[PDB]
Design a protein around this nucleic acid. Sequence first.
RNA 1: CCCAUAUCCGCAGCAGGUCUCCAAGGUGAACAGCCUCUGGCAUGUUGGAACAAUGUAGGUAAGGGAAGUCGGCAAGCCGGAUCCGUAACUUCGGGAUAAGGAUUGGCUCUAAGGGCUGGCAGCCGACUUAGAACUGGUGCGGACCAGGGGAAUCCGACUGU
RNA 2: UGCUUCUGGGUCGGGGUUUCGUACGUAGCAGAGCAGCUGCUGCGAUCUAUUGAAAGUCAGCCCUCGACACAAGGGUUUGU
Lengths: 131, 63, 107, 394
Amino acid sequence: SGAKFRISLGLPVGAVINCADNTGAKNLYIISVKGIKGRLNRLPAAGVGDMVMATVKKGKPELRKKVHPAVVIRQRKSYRRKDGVFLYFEDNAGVIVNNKGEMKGSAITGPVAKECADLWPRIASNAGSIA
Amino acid sequence: MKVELCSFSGYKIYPGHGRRYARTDGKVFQFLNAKCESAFLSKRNPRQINWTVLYRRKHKKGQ
Amino acid sequence: NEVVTREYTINIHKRIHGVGFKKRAPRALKEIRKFAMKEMGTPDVRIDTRLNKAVWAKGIRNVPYRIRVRLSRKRNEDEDSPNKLYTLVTYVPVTTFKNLQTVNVDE
Amino acid sequence: SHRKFSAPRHGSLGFLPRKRSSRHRGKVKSFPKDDPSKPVHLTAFLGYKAGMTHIVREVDRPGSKVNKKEVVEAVTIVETPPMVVVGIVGYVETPRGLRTFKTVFAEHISDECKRRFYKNWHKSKKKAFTKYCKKWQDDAGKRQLDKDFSSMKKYCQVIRVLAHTQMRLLPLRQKKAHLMEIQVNGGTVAEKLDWARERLEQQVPVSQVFGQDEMIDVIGVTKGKGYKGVTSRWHTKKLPRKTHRGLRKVACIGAWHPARVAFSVARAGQKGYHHRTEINKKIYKIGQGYLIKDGKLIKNNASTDYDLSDKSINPLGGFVHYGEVTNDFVMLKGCVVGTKKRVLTLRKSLLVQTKRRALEKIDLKFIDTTSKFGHGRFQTVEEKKAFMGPLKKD
RNA sequence: CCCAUAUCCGCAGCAGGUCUCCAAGGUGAACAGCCUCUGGCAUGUUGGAACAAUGUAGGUAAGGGAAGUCGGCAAGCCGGAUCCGUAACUUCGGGAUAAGGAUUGGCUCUAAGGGCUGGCAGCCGACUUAGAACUGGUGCGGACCAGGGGAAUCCGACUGU
RNA sequence: UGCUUCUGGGUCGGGGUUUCGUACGUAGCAGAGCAGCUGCUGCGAUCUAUUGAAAGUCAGCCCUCGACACAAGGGUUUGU
Ligand SMILES: [Mg+2]
Ligand SMILES: [Mg+2]
Ligand SMILES: [Mg+2]
Ligand SMILES: [Mg+2]
Ligand SMILES: [Mg+2]
Ligand SMILES: [Mg+2]
Ligand SMILES: [Mg+2]
Ligand SMILES: [Mg+2]
Ligand SMILES: [Mg+2]
Ligand SMILES: [Mg+2]
Ligand SMILES: [Mg+2]
Ligand SMILES: [Mg+2]
Ligand SMILES: [Mg+2]
Ligand SMILES: [Mg+2]
Ligand SMILES: [Mg+2]
């Protein structure tokens, strides 16, 4: 019910982010972002909690050469919360999911943003910690 | 809102100041400003920086 | 009391703030001369060659921030000049600038 | 041929011409529509932009992610010392619009206000309103005044008051007061005049015009920025680095036909210093000024029900480039137009405020008073000294 | 006498062209660049006040990293030296500084590397190399100087014009 | 925007704020070691105390009313 607020978008189309799940992918290459209507000359961009379409560049041979739905769980670009806190992570990370938001893997490495955690209960259950 | 303390200098951070840092290992740090943040990220020891709480406590300057 | 002498501190730093490197010390000499007219109301200001030397002592761009100077209003001896008086600006070396007031000097 | 890929035009054609405002003081283009059933009240006020800070508060927004939770919000501090009413002006509705009908000034007018009538106070003899003020001392002139007031009752339909600011209480260099007409909405026309006639030469605190949690409009002149190019003035795309003859330009300023440059194309010119009206700026706090009660100065106008520190709104070192706020102030959510020291016209809303955000009641938990002249990290000098310990100065 | 950002040729006191000799200290491999002494000059056919736009020449940018564009154009990364290490292919010469790593300050010492005289003794010495401790907020080829790299296709052997 | 209400702004000084990061000198039986004289004396990067020290801080930061002088001025026009 409660809607997520706008946050700074740090991951434009073309960003390679780490893969923080045990699927086998070592990184995720963003090719689009769900919900982006956009405008002329502007790259679609993503932030923690956003579902994106990505391809695996480094990882299991069976996982590559195809487009996966993924969700960004960490980003290096600091973003303001409504309690005034500017938070940023050591690295950019995502997890592969399906259309329904269920993790293709079964575990996550590293913390997950509270912004993405509250939006994806399937992702939250696998998070070791929440930032 | 509760006040934090800079993970480098020991100064306390009031709401709407500094940046919160979160490493891939799970530890979360708060920094009063970019002066403190840069020293922390360059792997400087606060105990060796004259103007920090950890330095003055190690050298008994207040005491 | 036309003939009078006072010792001033001039905050050169704020006078030349924002000026380009190759004009910083030339402009200080201009702000010192302009200061002299304001204080003594004399168009004929004469800046001593020691004060000029002091202002350039550190090159063209790192001019000293403060300089203590003495202003002495004197009678223009030549009757050919339209100006009856002139001001002589001399350098006053000081080991410190703290608490220096503007002082009356009586010869 | 048609442009290949669509794109919305840059800038609004509704704010043309992008010229320098002809007035320095924000002008109330439209006063709220008069409701005779309401009691007599004022509709505007003049404040000065002290500067910004940020506060903490607990939001009450059922169904929000920030319900029953704390949030940090920026606010603008607008100093609003009481205004002084000096004249009454009446208007008549005509088939050509309102026409100024009659103007009556007070018997006594302070030197802050008279400065407004002069381009050089130093060279003047201060003769303004010297022969007029005698109309209040002699019986014949008084009998002429209450005939003027009676005519304003018969004929006029809009009553305004001439209130000026009190610059001597502000920390600014300016001593010339800002004088504006404020419309008197409320009861009948007779009631408006008696209410206004009573207040000639009196002071009107801001708290009598506005109230807590009110949504108001701020009218002012934005920060001038001089001659600007299209890239900065109109926010158009920058041309490729290879462009010859410059790249901060609009490449095609028109088509061959019509053989003219249209008024809707971006061009270089003035940016800033534009008259603007911004609506729906909530009042987060109307702060009381400093009071000498029982020989002690009361200045804790930044303490809240949760922060009992005896501290004023002023941040350490004072408001940067403004000074010290020692009068009544209005704390408005968000930002407003203008530089520091800019005179701002506060006006009441022209709209009907029926929204959970408009009606929300504000309860400030914390007002930030750290220095804005650097990265201040202490709320009060006592807090600083207690943390730092004795210094070499002591 | 000039012999050249003003005495010569380019219409001129023109950022062009025009044959030579001598050649200090420091850093450094160095006639490199950077600073300086001898000698010389007065900023290059004007000055003052401002510091808008747009330029020309320099810089810096969070997160992303060619998504820009015909095309990585432009800029940027690399860069010295010591120690280690180094593939395909090859006409066995190369490729090659392939690729890829580590190190680098200051300070106080240690060891080795010589001549003259009369397996020893004494006196003179000139810069090097190597190792060790201590030390600074990990900064240290601190400015200057100073190769981005790899896998392939086409053409022409190469150097030269 | 300012230009005599013992008032005004100005300049200097001071205080506040803030930036950097702990000044020169001095002392040290702190200092890896080395040289000399019989424990002392020298060379020694660095360290510790003095010392959140020193230095800058409106030129478009804030407050003084401590010091100093200045300020009742000058020019051109305008009439129903
Ligand atoms: Mg495009
Ligand atoms: Mg169309
Ligand atoms: Mg071109
Ligand atoms: Mg600030
Ligand atoms: Mg030049
Ligand atoms: Mg010249
Ligand atoms: Mg010439
Ligand atoms: Mg020229
Ligand atoms: Mg960038
Ligand atoms: Mg970056
Ligand atoms: Mg492309
Ligand atoms: Mg394209
Ligand atoms: Mg290139
Ligand atoms: Mg090769
Ligand atoms: Mg060839």
